[PDB]
Design a protein around this ligand. Sequence first.
Ligand SMILES: *[C@@H]1O[C@H](CO)[C@@H](O[C@@H]2O[C@H](CO)[C@@H](O[C@@H]3O[C@H](CO[C@@H]4O[C@H](CO)[C@@H](O)[C@H](O)[C@@H]4O)[C@@H](O)[C@H](O[C@@H]4O[C@H](CO)[C@@H](O)[C@H](O)[C@@H]4O)[C@@H]3O)[C@H](O)[C@H]2NC(C)=O)[C@H](O)[C@H]1NC(C)=O
Ligand SMILES: *[C@@H]1O[C@H](CO)[C@@H](O[C@@H]2O[C@H](CO)[C@@H](O[C@@H]3O[C@H](CO)[C@@H](O)[C@H](O)[C@@H]3O)[C@H](O)[C@H]2NC(C)=O)[C@H](O)[C@H]1NC(C)=O
Ligand SMILES: *[C@@H]1O[C@H](CO)[C@@H](O[C@@H]2O[C@H](CO)[C@@H](O)[C@H](O)[C@H]2NC(C)=O)[C@H](O)[C@H]1NC(C)=O
Ligand SMILES: *[C@@H]1O[C@H](CO)[C@@H](O)[C@H](O)[C@H]1NC(C)=O
Lengths: 112, 225, 97
Amino acid sequence: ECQAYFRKVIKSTFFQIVMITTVTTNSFLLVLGTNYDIQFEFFRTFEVSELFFVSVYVCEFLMKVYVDPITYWKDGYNILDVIILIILTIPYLLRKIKGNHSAYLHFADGIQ
Amino acid sequence: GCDMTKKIVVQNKISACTMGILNPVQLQKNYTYTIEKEAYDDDLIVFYEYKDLGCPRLVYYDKPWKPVVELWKNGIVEEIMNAEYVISEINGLVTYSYSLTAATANCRSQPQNWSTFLWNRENYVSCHEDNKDNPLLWPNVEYQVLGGQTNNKIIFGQRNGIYTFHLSVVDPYYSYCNLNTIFSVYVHGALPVTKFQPLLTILLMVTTTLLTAWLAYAIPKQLRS
Amino acid sequence: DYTFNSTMEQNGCINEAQTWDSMIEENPDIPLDDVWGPQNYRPCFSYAIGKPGDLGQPYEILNYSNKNHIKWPMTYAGMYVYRLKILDPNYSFCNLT
Ligand SMILES: *[C@@H]1O[C@H](CO)[C@@H](O[C@@H]2O[C@H](CO)[C@@H](O[C@@H]3O[C@H](CO[C@@H]4O[C@H](CO)[C@@H](O)[C@H](O)[C@@H]4O)[C@@H](O)[C@H](O[C@@H]4O[C@H](CO)[C@@H](O)[C@H](O)[C@@H]4O)[C@@H]3O)[C@H](O)[C@H]2NC(C)=O)[C@H](O)[C@H]1NC(C)=O
Ligand SMILES: *[C@@H]1O[C@H](CO)[C@@H](O[C@@H]2O[C@H](CO)[C@@H](O[C@@H]3O[C@H](CO)[C@@H](O)[C@H](O)[C@@H]3O)[C@H](O)[C@H]2NC(C)=O)[C@H](O)[C@H]1NC(C)=O
Ligand SMILES: *[C@@H]1O[C@H](CO)[C@@H](O[C@@H]2O[C@H](CO)[C@@H](O)[C@H](O)[C@H]2NC(C)=O)[C@H](O)[C@H]1NC(C)=O
Ligand SMILES: *[C@@H]1O[C@H](CO)[C@@H](O)[C@H](O)[C@H]1NC(C)=O
């Protein structure tokens, strides 16, 4: 039914521009995050931007949760990006709200 | 009796000054620091003294840390101190946990904590003897005693502030002198958490519902064309 | 225009010392002979007395067991008639210059 319009929307350059802008702001967040001051202070911007980024990435995985994984199981770049989404989503789900038994921090800059 | 020439010092091999946080040239002129309402119940503030303390030690959050104390006779290093010693807070904060809680320390006589009342060489009866009428009411009550043959340390909180450790050497077989000191440490953690009851999964579900609402809004866009 | 071997540090001075320019600044009008001496001396290796100032300025409390030599600008030629005075406040009973 509406799959044609959804694929037309996903072909539009504006959604890709918004995605690229969000992940470039994520790159700048990592650039400011290797510092120590903005790491934990003057960091409300970090919090709201990271919430925006994880919302955008969850939305991207929702676009890639379609029947198109019949092509995201044999291809090249496509399996790489969905597996990257999985190994992104799971750790910060068990890191940002952890409450668990774990040793220490070695995958913040790695996830970014 | 006591030997008045003996004293205890804490090593300050590298200190928090002379790097990109604080400088020695400023702290003496009333460099007052903040407490974020975690000691007893409000607007408590702390006043560091550089002359009395010096440059404070620097450790990191979630690092198993133990102070190492040395004995001095006539102003000369002679031997590190290996007896059992305890620490406390003069201000009275609770935002620091302890290591392995006395069961993996093989305690057998219900050790006493900072709740029986100051500790000294007098009040202290250990728990590693075989006293016959208080073995346990204790699954995992902690072991508020460092040093000695055991290997328990202090796990730090995430407050990111200066702490003033008041240290008392507690073994009653080392010397008759009530060895005691005051030293200062400072922690520089990773990140405070202001996530509250909104979880990552809760906000994820909110975003999924909003995106499905957007799709249900864009369905008539294809329907109207 | 005259300096010496070293600075505050590399000589062991834990806290801020007291140099010649600061002490000439200390005394407004009285001549130099009453500016600094054994009646006014405070050591640098103190950690409690005067100041935790920034360290690295020229150090003029020169003595033996210290290497502290004298230095002058290389370019121009001149003379500086130096009078040497002993600063230790419990060395002798009299003045030695
Ligand atoms: C000729 O000039 C030379 C230097 O130009 C002088 O040599 C210096 O002598 C000083 C004392 O006579 C030395 O001062 C240092 O003072 C420190 C005192 O700090 C204490 O810290 C404790 C901490 O608990 C406090 O309670 C105390 O109240 C004090 O504040 C000492 O720690 C220090 O001892 C060692 O020094 C060496 C450096 O050689 C360090 O590497 C070491 O870690 C330790 O701290 C020392 O006593 C000063 O070091 C020394 N400098 C040199 C280069 O030798 C001579 O004294 C002058 N001649 C005469 C006759 O006065
Ligand atoms: C400091 O040490 C004392 C021991 O002298 C501790 O008191 C004892 O603590 C244990 C563990 O909490 C208590 O056992 C359990 O108590 C709970 C109620 O909190 C009960 O539901 C369990 O069934 C079990 O009985 C024990 O009763 C208690 N003893 C007394 C006399 O109160 C104390 O908790 C230690 N405090 C700290 C901060 O470590
Ligand atoms: C100050 O300059 C003098 C140069 O006169 C340096 O003196 C040398 O010091 C070393 C250290 O023990 C001796 O082995 C040499 O024999 C000295 N040479 C001379 C010519 O005196 C001294 O090192 C300089 N001080 C500093 C801090 O660099
Ligand atoms: C800090 O304390 C010192 C001594 O207690 C006092 O002289 C000074 O005025 C104080 N400064 C401020 C800003 O409170």
